[PDB]
Design a protein around this ligand. Structure first.
Ligand SMILES: [Zn+2]
Ligand SMILES: [Zn+2]
Ligand SMILES: [Zn+2]
Ligand SMILES: [Zn+2]
Ligand SMILES: [Zn+2]
Ligand SMILES: [Zn+2]
Lengths: 346, 346, 346
């Protein structure tokens, strides 16, 4: 079963690096309802201790922030200059409905447009219909205000879903349903569920949250899409409906073969199909995470999406439920001896 | 003397980020034979304690991984899509003999080819003569398999050598011969010989291994070649036969003048000529290493090579022997008072 | 069965136009062991009379030479300038392992590199690690020395093989196995097996050897590959595993319909599938051969390969065995009345 109102709430929440209160508050409400202790790092990353165990520490990590824009400047004509926060697709920077969230938490709708030069779109502005600097000031808008795509979460035919911020609200969704499923479970590992701050602008909350937790093993949840959307050939290992992705490599991390092989054997036991994927361009917080302290065995997993870093992505509900199932099964098998065996280089 | 069978074993070993077992086992055999304690970081970096001393901690660091490719995908026709691991030269991605190592450690030879567009070569595929997907599966080949240049180590005239992975197997070679020479020596410093994991893909095993060791001083061993191979002019400071290189700067590190001055005085005492070099394009272990904790006085040194990040590099045996001699002499002189003198900013 | 040691010997032999002694000696050893008469043309082409017959003269022709390079010049720095011999692929002229054979028959390994400008790669140099002119002289290297790809012959999965010079060492291989099989056979034709000199540089040994033999009919054995390697569509008629190629046309020859029809009927009788192919870009022995004297009915056949004129090609052993079988069957059926029928224009 999908909780579509939770997925709607997370998708529609407006949260960028350093202003993630809308996502944080959802997570905090879930933890408080289940009487779970919440800790924070210096950046505001949410650290939820699932349980108490003398077994190995496992961190399951998602990012709270989405790609968007930030108010930079207001012109005398009431044009709102913005800069991108994260890698917003160049093709998603022209004539796009957006909304601006002010310090008083008011939301003002607008149309974003930019100048195109070849590949690149820069000099972006948001139009709220204002004719003066003062009209914008009156709406409560200020430099630093977050700007996000103006997308309503929607259900698609055949149990697929569409909305903004699936990178990485799908994984925030998974953190919550893991918490709901496993809050009273007897587990062989101590599990920390981490929603890290500010991933889209680099590798920020990932680093600090990992240090605060100090896991023995880490699972980073992120998503990705194939550039050629309707190419269902053997080269596309990011096809929605074909099961969770197991990321073998990205620019920041090459997954450890022992951990990869173990997860594959668990997925095969429980009947979850896996897509083994490699990122040619992208980075995840997998990179910063594994390089913490003296090194953490880490891999990246997640459901595939179509499109990404734009007004809307598409995901398949079965993929999401299967990731939930695989994560739970992995957690239930992560014994001290298992994690020792997966880190023995002799 | 040169141990050519050792250099052959190291050069011909196939080891990329996260799959360095072929090099690690060679290192482990050397340490065991000399009854030396071996530790690991979380990434599998090999940490060899040479001795016990109350003097300063000295780390000598080389990397285990080589540039290569990784199996990404297998088409219905039996084409094996691969992605580069590390910066493989663009001119080394077309019609190159390679071999793939499977999870069962079988080695399947193949021909790599890529699609050239201008400077760039991408969409790389390996051909093993297969006609179907299932033929490749039957050979044991899977996504994630390491792919390396199919190069046999060879002796050249006038005591020079040619083979793959000289970056950084020449430096792994140096770690071993230092271990063989100094295993029973009385030394003013506690020496750690570190073969770090995953350097070609970033600041990876270097960072974590340095933290595990916490040295007072670090020498990072790496190699480089001059782009204009037969220009023996004054601007080429990477000429084979002209002595070990002392790297004054690279993208990731500017060596401390106090440390470089000291090394220069030791080399002049023992009659080892040095080439002072600056990297305009490249980075090293050096960058990650010196930024560890509150900062480690660090420099980069090593034998020059011709060519690099391709099927074969060329090195001069005299250069290698002189580096070995300079490393031993530095270690014998690294007293507590020396390393305090070289770190005094007052 | 395949004689892999023979194919290895032929593939690994280093032989270019005017220096084909390594292949010629292999051929001479086979003929002597079977007490067969060997003649030469003025270029050194090897002419083997299989038998004595009053029937029509049949020539079966392969070429001895491979594409490679030739030492042109040695600089004061010990760089060895080379020029290509034959059409070496442009994508096979950069960072390629090679070896140089001197007049004393020593083999010095090296790395070839070239200067790319657009499509073209020129100003090729070989590096043997030398630092001076005199170092190269001391190694025995001189202008005129042959330079070949440094490729070891290798077995691939599913009974396929990989090595250099498959163009045209696969066909030299076929000459030898035909000689071994048919040395004592009673035949309706007088068969001449010809390994011609210097094909890669023009219409060279083909022309002169044909004149020395004056055949009534000629089969020229050569190989080709399809530019788009993994396109197994209907337009690729050079797929390994799909049977020997019958060349309907190339730049230098349009095969006689009467001859191609006959061969097609023989192949269908014995169950050998054929791929009918047309060269849009290439020429062969076929062109020079058919224009000899008052004209010789001639066609080109051979096993397909993948890749060509580079460090390594791939071939399918079944294709090679089927060509051997088709050649033997053609020879056994080539009666005086057959070859008169196939040349009657009235
Ligand atoms: Zn993202
Ligand atoms: Zn993400
Ligand atoms: Zn390198
Ligand atoms: Zn290196
Ligand atoms: Zn040819
Ligand atoms: Zn040919």
């Amino acid at each position: 079963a999908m909780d579509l109102s939770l997925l709607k709430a997370l998708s529609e929440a407006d949260a960028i690096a350093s202003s993630e209160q809308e996502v944080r508050q959802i997570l905090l409400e879930e933890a408080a309802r289940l009487q779970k202790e919440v800790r924070f790092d210096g950046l505001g990353s949410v650290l939820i201790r699932l349980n108490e165990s003398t077994g190995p520490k496992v961190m399951i990590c998602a990012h709270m922030d989405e790609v968007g824009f930030m108010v930079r400047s207001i012109s005398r004509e009431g044009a709102i200059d913005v800069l991108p926060v994260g890698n917003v697709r160049m093709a998603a920077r022209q004539l796009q409905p957006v909304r601006i969230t002010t310090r008083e938490e008011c939301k003002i709708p607008g149309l974003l447009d930019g100048d195109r030069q070849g590949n690149d779109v820069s000099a972006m502005r948001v139009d709220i219909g204002a004719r003066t600097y003062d009209e914008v000031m009156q709406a409560g808008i200020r430099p630093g205000d977050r700007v996000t795509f103006d997308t309503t979460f929607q259900v698609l035919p055949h149990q697929r879903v569409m909305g903004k911020a699936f990178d990485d609200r799908l994984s925030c969704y998974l953190l919550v349903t893991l918490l709901r499923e496993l809050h009273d479970a007897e587990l062989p590992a101590e599990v920390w569920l981490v929603a890290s701050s500010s991933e889209e602008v680099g590798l920020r909350g990932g680093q600090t949250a990992t240090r605060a937790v100090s896991p023995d093993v880490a699972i980073v949840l992120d998503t990705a899409c194939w550039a050629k959307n309707f190419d269902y050939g053997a080269a596309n290992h990011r096809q929605i409906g074909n099961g969770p992705m197991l990321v073998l490599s990205d620019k920041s991390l090459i997954a450890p073969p022992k951990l990869t092989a173990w997860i594959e054997t668990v997925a095969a036991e429980i009947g979850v199909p896996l897509q083994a994927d490699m990122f040619s361009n992208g980075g995840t917080d997998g990179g910063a995470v594994h390089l913490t302290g003296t090194g953490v065995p880490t891999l990246v997993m997640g459901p595939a999406t179509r499109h990404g870093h734009c007004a809307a992505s598409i995901a398949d509900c079965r993929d999401i439920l299967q990731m939930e199932q695989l994560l739970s099964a992995l957690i239930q098998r992560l014994t001290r001896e298992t994690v020792v065996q997966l880190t023995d280089f002799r």
